[PDB]
Design a protein around this nucleic acid. Structure first.
Ligand SMILES: [Mg+2]
Ligand SMILES: [Mg+2]
Ligand SMILES: [Mg+2]
Ligand SMILES: [Mg+2]
Ligand SMILES: [Mg+2]
Ligand SMILES: [Mg+2]
Ligand SMILES: [Mg+2]
Ligand SMILES: [Mg+2]
Ligand SMILES: [Mg+2]
Ligand SMILES: [Mg+2]
Ligand SMILES: [Mg+2]
Ligand SMILES: [Mg+2]
Ligand SMILES: [Mg+2]
Ligand SMILES: [Mg+2]
Ligand SMILES: [Mg+2]
Ligand SMILES: [Mg+2]
Ligand SMILES: [Mg+2]
Ligand SMILES: [Mg+2]
Ligand SMILES: [Mg+2]
Ligand SMILES: [Mg+2]
Ligand SMILES: [Mg+2]
Ligand SMILES: [Mg+2]
Ligand SMILES: [Mg+2]
Ligand SMILES: [Mg+2]
Ligand SMILES: [Mg+2]
Ligand SMILES: [Mg+2]
Ligand SMILES: [Mg+2]
Ligand SMILES: [Mg+2]
Ligand SMILES: [Mg+2]
Ligand SMILES: [Mg+2]
Ligand SMILES: [Mg+2]
Ligand SMILES: [Mg+2]
Ligand SMILES: [Mg+2]
Ligand SMILES: [Mg+2]
Ligand SMILES: [Mg+2]
Ligand SMILES: [Mg+2]
Ligand SMILES: [Mg+2]
Ligand SMILES: [Mg+2]
Ligand SMILES: [Mg+2]
Ligand SMILES: [Mg+2]
Ligand SMILES: [Mg+2]
Ligand SMILES: [Mg+2]
Ligand SMILES: [Mg+2]
Ligand SMILES: [Mg+2]
Ligand SMILES: [Mg+2]
Ligand SMILES: [Mg+2]
Ligand SMILES: [Mg+2]
Ligand SMILES: [Zn+2]
Ligand SMILES: [Zn+2]
Lengths: 141, 69, 181, 110, 189, 53
RNA sequence: GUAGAGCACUGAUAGGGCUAGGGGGCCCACCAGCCUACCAAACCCUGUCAAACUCCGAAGGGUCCCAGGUGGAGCCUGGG
RNA sequence: GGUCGCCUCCUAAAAGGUAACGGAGGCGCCCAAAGGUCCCCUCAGGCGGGACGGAAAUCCGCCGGAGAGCGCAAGGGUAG
RNA sequence: UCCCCCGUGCCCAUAGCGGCGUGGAACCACCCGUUCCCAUUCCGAACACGGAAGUGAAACGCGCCAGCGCCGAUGGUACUGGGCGGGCGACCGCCUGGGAGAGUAGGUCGGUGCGGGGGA
């Protein structure tokens, strides 16, 4: 999993999600990255899920980079309880993701091989995705 | 100075062990030390005195090599 | 301001060897003493008994001045400190009182220690000063024996307008410092 | 970063400045002593009487007492009575003190 | 090596329209000039993929004046990851600071140990006159084991060129692979 | 107040009428209070003390 | 002082360099060798997240002056 | 079951104000010095030195704009 | 009336840090002493007086450059007051005034106001 080992407050507000991403819009370490196309709350259990996927795809090899880190606490009321009497309890953590953000990028492996281990990676993901190539544009910022 | 708390340092002599009348301005009218600067196993050369050895190791104890070599 | 033979030794002997050494241009930039802070940080009369100043009277007989106390910065469980207890003493020696103290330590007191073997030379500051310490208190016979009690010592810095540790040594060595190395 | 010297200035300076009444700054070097009356609104000097321009010499304190009395004449003739005393980063005593007692007896008002 | 590209002018007409017109907005400037320009997205793409911020761009104008240029910053529209505005730094003699590529060569020991090469920088900041703007800078990475790293100072640096960034900055390194063997006790704690 | 912090009316001397009241501690300084206080009654400054509240 | 944005502060943070400590070596076990595809503080680089973080900062909103504004405007004292 | 008055921050959408069994914390005292004033001093911290004496007892050196302190919670403030 | 120092504001780091040089003629600083007034939880360190041998080494004044700090546009984008639109929904987009923060090109080792002194 991926808890932030420590934190300033425990329960976090919910928040909107208006518009286009803030940063993380260019490859930076790998040579191929995975790109978000629609807003989301990606979960500690998904990030992990997608990661493990590729690692088991090119077993012994590559270097997986992971650009979004689940810091926000997903909160939720128990079952058979009604509205109010406290705010929900924490179960799991998430990372806010807008469209354009890179989430994974792998470095150093056969072009075919990265193009799969990032393809499979997307299916573990709750959203639409596009794989991308490191770029003159990317090295241009 | 802020008087009324300080030991009045008159002129005074520190008459030492061997020579050296370390004439000074002392807080006592006459104090007496027995060891001085000039004489010291450090100030003046390495200085011999007693310090020559203790258990001389080893051939330097002499008369070694009694057989044929 | 007083006829002391070390004041005169610094001038009529120590001043020149330094100008011939590090080849100074101007006269003030030549290395020169400033103070001798003597810290008798006892830490043993905190909420402990009176008698603290029973050294700060012999401390006066050494240094000619009256020592003024130092208090507890902050409370510590492991030392028994509450923010305010007195732990030690400190006298700052400026002007001729400073000199005449060294004109007794450097050539009478330093040899009055048993198993004495010069001075530690690594202990120079970095911007031109030097310090160490001492344990035995009747190391100057101004403090005579039948003023007998528990023996305690002092931390001693000496402060100079030396600009590096290098030239600094040359001063303190030239004014009679036996160096162990 | 600051020296205790310049802090003491501001400090002693700041207060007096808040009461609006005129300002008799007292500058003092090991050689001479100077002073000048200032309106601090417009930021201008009313009258300046110094030990150096007066070409006086003969003991520093007693030198000043005149330079103080000198300042009062050169200002009364101008219309100033009300003026509060700035004592710089110096303890009011002796030299600065003199300048005041001089200005005081010359008819000046603080 | 050194590329030419057609260009034109922007008076004030709407960027939004030029963009949907397929012509990219832009600007060029130095220390004496500032000029609103516009290029052509297709054509710009052609060149910039080859060029980037590394090689030289010759801006051909309607008045027929040519211009020596470096792209300074490219703005990308986030949702799309597509061009929306470039800065064109026209060069005088003065040794402008700029980024030149690096060529990693000689397979490291770690890469024959099944490791990987983490080349952090693909470029490098330099002060260097236009009269000799280099390309491939030599980097000998053959002899780095896994975990080992080569820094900045240790570099060829073709004479007449100044290492215009940190000495102990880190250009490239070599790290362990990805074992599924890892995945085992990765789980444990 | 509480119990270690007692309430008290500042007494008097130069007319023996009380004219003030405040607070103090008897576990800290366990004596009788001390302040100069002009009075509307004697029209003079006077040294004062205490009694319970 | 918000949206944005940012990391200067309070914290989070993934990779890298550096690097106290800690752990596995192991030389050896008296002190000491300083060697580590292991952990890891403080720091530097790339790269990021925050209602109770802000080096910055909109549109906007408030309000006073001036002008337009004759309206089932406005203002005061009262009865329902 | 929890709550009930007062204080701090956030929610609160850049004046004020603003709800919820919304997220977080404090008060029911204390001080004849911790008050008045006139005077003087400047921190936390980090690196080097320092007999006991250490991570930190007191000491010396450069280093530092406020990250310390300001009785107690938090915020604003604060070395001119 | 230009120049130089001393005092003192105004501006709020483009002014600062660090660096190289530098000026004692006059001012200013260190400085000489500790009798006197004044002072140190110890010390003439500071503050204080009495002077004037030395010195501009320190501090300070003035010059020099961009290593840091700092100021930093134009173009464009974010967001947005007003007005509209297509989506089954998630959300996107259009006209209209407004328009950042980052970042680029660059700027900066200050500018000043009255008083005093001192040479053009
Ligand atoms: Mg979904
Ligand atoms: Mg004799
Ligand atoms: Mg004499
Ligand atoms: Mg201290
Ligand atoms: Mg003004
Ligand atoms: Mg526009
Ligand atoms: Mg090409
Ligand atoms: Mg967009
Ligand atoms: Mg190694
Ligand atoms: Mg009454
Ligand atoms: Mg980690
Ligand atoms: Mg070990
Ligand atoms: Mg080794
Ligand atoms: Mg090693
Ligand atoms: Mg760090
Ligand atoms: Mg975000
Ligand atoms: Mg916010
Ligand atoms: Mg701010
Ligand atoms: Mg506005
Ligand atoms: Mg109003
Ligand atoms: Mg009515
Ligand atoms: Mg109101
Ligand atoms: Mg008080
Ligand atoms: Mg102090
Ligand atoms: Mg400290
Ligand atoms: Mg100690
Ligand atoms: Mg210690
Ligand atoms: Mg606060
Ligand atoms: Mg103004
Ligand atoms: Mg320089
Ligand atoms: Mg120069
Ligand atoms: Mg020179
Ligand atoms: Mg010079
Ligand atoms: Mg000179
Ligand atoms: Mg005092
Ligand atoms: Mg003092
Ligand atoms: Mg100039
Ligand atoms: Mg230079
Ligand atoms: Mg710069
Ligand atoms: Mg703009
Ligand atoms: Mg828009
Ligand atoms: Mg409006
Ligand atoms: Mg609208
Ligand atoms: Mg749409
Ligand atoms: Mg420039
Ligand atoms: Mg400068
Ligand atoms: Mg002249
Ligand atoms: Zn002898
Ligand atoms: Zn009465």
């Amino acid at each position: 999993m991926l808890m932030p080992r420590r934190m300033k407050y425990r329960k976090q507000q919910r928040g909107r999600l208006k518009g286009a991403t803030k940063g993380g819009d260019y490859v930076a370490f790998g040579d191929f990255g995975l790109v978000a196309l629609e807003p989301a709350w990606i979960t500690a259990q998904q990030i992990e899920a997608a990661r493990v996927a590729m690692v088991r795809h090119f077993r012994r090899g590559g270097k997986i980079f992971i650009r979004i880190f689940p810091d926000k606490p997903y909160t939720k009321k128990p079952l058979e309880v009604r509205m109010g009497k406290g705010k929900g309890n924490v179960e799991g953590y998430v990372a806010v993701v807008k469209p354009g953000r890179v989430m994974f990028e792998v470095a150093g492996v056969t072009e075919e091989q990265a193009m799969e281990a990032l393809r499979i990676a997307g299916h573990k993901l709750p959203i639409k995705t596009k794989i991308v190539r490191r770029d003159a544009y990317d090295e241009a910022q | 100075m802020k008087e009324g708390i300080h030991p009045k340092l008159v002129p005074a002599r520190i008459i030492c062990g061997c020579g050296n009348v370390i004439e000074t301005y002392s807080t006592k009218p006459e104090i007496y030390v027995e060891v001085c600067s000039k004489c010291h196993p450090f100030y003046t050369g390495q200085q011999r005195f007693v310090d020559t050895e203790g258990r001389v190791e080893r051939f330097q104890r002499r008369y070694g090599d009694s057989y044929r070599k | 301001p007083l006829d002391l033979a070390l004041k005169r030794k610094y001038y009529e002997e120590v001043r020149p060897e330094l100008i011939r050494r590090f080849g100074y241009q101007n006269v003030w930039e030549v290395p020169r003493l400033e103070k001798v802070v003597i810290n008798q940080g006892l830490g043993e009369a905190k909420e402990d008994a009176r008698i603290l100043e029973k050294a700060a009277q012999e401390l006066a007989l050494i240094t000619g001045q009256k020592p003024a106390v130092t208090r507890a910065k902050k409370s510590i469980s492991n030392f028994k400190l509450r923010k305010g207890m007195p732990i030690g003493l400190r006298v700052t020696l400026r002007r001729d009182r400073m000199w005449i103290f060294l004109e007794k330590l450097l050539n009478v007191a330093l040899p009055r220690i048993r198993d004495f073997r010069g001075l530690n030379p690594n202990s120079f500051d970095g911007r031109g000063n030097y310090n160490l310490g001492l344990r035995e208190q009747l190391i100057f016979p101004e403090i005579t024996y039948d003023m007998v009690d528990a023996l305690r010592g002092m931390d001693i810095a000496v402060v100079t307008t030396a600009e590096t540790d290098e030239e600094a040594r040359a001063l303190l060595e030239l004014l009679g410092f036996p160096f162990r190395k | 970063r600051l020296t205790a010297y310049e802090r003491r200035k501001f400090r002693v300076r700041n207060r007096i400045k808040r009461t609006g009444r005129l300002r008799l700054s007292v500058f003092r070097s090991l050689k001479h002593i100077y002073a000048q009356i200032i309106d601090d609104e417009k930021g201008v000097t009313l009258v300046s009487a110094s030990s150096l321009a007066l070409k006086l010499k003969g003991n520093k304190t007693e030198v000043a007492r005149q330079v103080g009395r000198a300042l009062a004449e050169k200002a009364l003739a101008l219309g100033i009575k009300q003026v509060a005393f700035d004592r710089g980063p110096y303890k009011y005593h002796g030299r600065v003190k003199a300048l005041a007692e001089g200005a005081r007896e010359g008819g000046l008002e603080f | 090596m050194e590329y030419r590209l057609k260009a034109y002018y922007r008076e004030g007409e709407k960027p939004s329209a030029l963009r949907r017109a397929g012509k990219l907005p832009g600007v060029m400037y130095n220390r004496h000039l500032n000029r609103k320009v516009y290029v052509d997205l297709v054509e710009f793409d052609k060149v910039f993929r080859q060029a980037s911020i590394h090689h030289v761009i010759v801006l051909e104008l309607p008045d027929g004046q040519s211009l020596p240029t470096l792209v300074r910053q490219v703005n990308l529209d986030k949702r799309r990851r597509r061009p929306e505005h470039v800065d064109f730094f026209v060069l005088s003699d003065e040794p402008v600071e700029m980024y030149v590529p690096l060529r990693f060569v000689g397979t490291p020991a770690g890469v024959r140990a099944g490791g990987v090469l983490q080349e952090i920088h693909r470029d490098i900041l330099v002060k260097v006159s236009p009269r000799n703007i280099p390309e491939f800078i030599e980097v000998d990475v053959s002899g780095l084991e896994i975990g080992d790293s080569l820094h900045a100072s240790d570099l060829k640096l073709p004479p007449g060129v100044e290492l215009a960034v940190s000495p102990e900055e880190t250009i490239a390194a070599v790290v362990p692979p990805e074992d599924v063997e890892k995945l085992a006790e990765e789980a444990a704690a | 107040a509480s119990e270690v912090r007692i309430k008290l009316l500042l007494e008097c001397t130069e007319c023996k009428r009380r004219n003030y009241a405040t607070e103090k501690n008897k576990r800290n300084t366990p004596n009788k209070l001390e302040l100069r206080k002009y009075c509307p009654w004697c029209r003079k400054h006077t040294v004062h003390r205490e009694v319970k509240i």
